[PDB]
Every structure is written in structure tokens, then in C-alpha cells.
Amino acid sequence: MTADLKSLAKRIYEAYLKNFNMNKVKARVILSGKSNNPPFVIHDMETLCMAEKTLVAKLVANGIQNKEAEVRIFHCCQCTSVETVTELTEFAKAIPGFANLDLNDQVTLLKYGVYEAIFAMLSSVMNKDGMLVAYGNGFITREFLKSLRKPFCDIMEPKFDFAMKFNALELDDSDISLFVAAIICCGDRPGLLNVGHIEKMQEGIVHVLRLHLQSNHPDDIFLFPKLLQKMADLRQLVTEHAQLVQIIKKTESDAALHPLLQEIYRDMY
């Protein structure tokens, strides 16, 4: 007559496999070079423009009215975030207690948590040379993103830096699913109404995470505190990312921000 924490961990993992279009196994199969619709490599302007014509044709169907390359890239980044936000919102229903919260608290938790979760999961599609994009159908190089004009070259590099260290922890999907659930369940988000119930939701999911890591990673006795630190690092990465997005908003008139993301950023930090 106790909670079955192993079963809860499996429920979380299954919800993550169902709700996210990309997972670490799927990404690694693509990244390894394994036969139908392999990713198109974007390493320079020529290959960016070829990939766009095949994979996002509408965005470049405007002739002389097409936006600048960097702005098109930023638009594609935002489309990816909007999709991942939708996936995270459905995933969160699997977290014990989340769907029992008031709707406004669900919204606040997702508002602060989504970009932390986005950058954690992005590590799964990154290696030291580049990252998968467009539902696994493109691979854009880290050097190409660094070559973009300021401020757009400053978007991805800190995320690659985070990812290389995160990937060295050698987490699998069963671990990452619980880490993402724990990110969402933070009782210290600004503006929460029912802090007490959220704190107990957080305690429960972090307990599931700690026990799972103990079992799944017997070789790394500090993995749990390492991941607690990664959550704090992600909060700082998101604060800095939001500051850069605000610079883009103020100084780049063509880089329209999608309304869902503007709402996430509004009053965030």
C-alpha cells in the first residue's frame, strides 16, 4: 500500500516517448548516418537556401520579399519552440498532480518551465559539430550558426556549450523524461497561487527522479546533484536567452516574434 515509484517513472517515460517528436534514440540513429530521407546538411548559405527550398518552401517563395537569411533562421527556431511548447503541454498531463492544479498555475509552470525543458532536450539533437532540425531532416552546423551576423550568431552557441556537458552525463530517454518533468514542477516560479501543492508535486517527482538515477546510473553516485545543478544552469541560460530575444525584438524589425512566444516571454524575467 505504497506509491509504486518504478511504475511512475515508466509512466513518465512512456508519456515522453508518445508526446515528443524527437527522442535521443531517434536522434542518434539519424546522427550516426543510418537510409530513407537522410538529413540535408546545412553548412553555408548555399546549402541553407537549398534546404529551405525543399523543407520550408513557403518561407522562401516570396522572391525579393524573402526575409534576410538570419531572420528566416530565427523564424524557423521559433517554429521549433512553438511545437515543443505544444508537446510539453500535453506531456505535463502525465505528471502526478499537474492536471489537478488550477489552470492558472498550470499556465505559470509551463510559462517558466518550457524554455528550460527546451534547452535540456535540445542537447539530444546536438553534437559538437551541429544539430538536427526540421523534424530530423536537416543537420545545421555549429560553425554555420556562429557565422551569422550579430545578434543571430549569439543564439545557439551557449546552448551547444550547455549540451556538450549535459551529453557527457550519458543520460538516456528514461532519465531525461523525469528531468523534464522535474523542471516543470518548480514551486518557486513567480506568481504561483498554490505553492504548497506545487511543492508537494515537485517533491514527489524529484523523489521518482532520484530513485531512478540511483538504479539506472549506479556508476555515478553524484548524478542527482549534478542534475539539480543543471536545472539551475538552465534557469540562467533561459534568463540570458530572453534578454537576447528582447534585443532582437527592439533592434530587428523583420524578426517577428510568434504571439505564443511573446506571451511566454512577457513578464518572465
Ligand X SMILES: CC/C=C\C/C=C\C/C=C\C/C=C\C/C=C\CCCC(=O)O
Q: Detail the residues annotated as belonging to a binding site.
A: 81, 115, 265
- 81 sits near ligand X (criterion: CB under 6 A): yes
Residues 220, 207: Cα–Cα separation, whole Å? 17
Binds ligand X by CB under 6 A, chosen from 73, 114, 120, 201: 73
Binds ligand X by CB under 6 A, chosen from 12, 27, 52, 205: 52
Stretch that binds ligand X, among 17-25, 77-85, 101-109, 165-173 (CB under 6 A): 77-85
Q: What is the DSSP string of 28-41?
A: HHHHTT---SPPEE
- 56 sits near ligand X (criterion: CB under 6 A): yes
* Beta strand segments in the chain, E: 40-42, 126-127, 130-133, 138-141
| Strand pairing category for 40-42 and 130-133 | unpaired
- 248 sits near ligand X (criterion: CB under 6 A): no
Backbone angles phi, psi at 104, to 5 degrees: -65, -35
Residues 52, 156: Cα–Cα separation, whole Å? 19
- 245 sits near ligand X (criterion: CB under 6 A): yes
- Smallest gap from Cβ 205 to ligand X, in A, equals 25
* Beta strand segments in 24-150, E: 40-42, 126-127, 130-133, 138-141
- 76 sits near ligand X (criterion: CB under 6 A): yes
Q: Which residues pair with 126 in a beta bridge?
A: 131
- Smallest gap from Cβ 34 to ligand X, in A, equals 21
Looking only at residues 115 through 174 of this chain, which bind ligand X when binding is defined by CB under 6 A? Answer: 122, 133-134, 138, 140, 155
Binds ligand X by CB under 6 A, chosen from 8, 9, 51, 148: 51
Q: List contacts with ligand X (CB under 6 A).
A: 51-52, 55-56, 73, 76-78, 80-81, 122, 133-134, 138, 140, 155, 245, 261
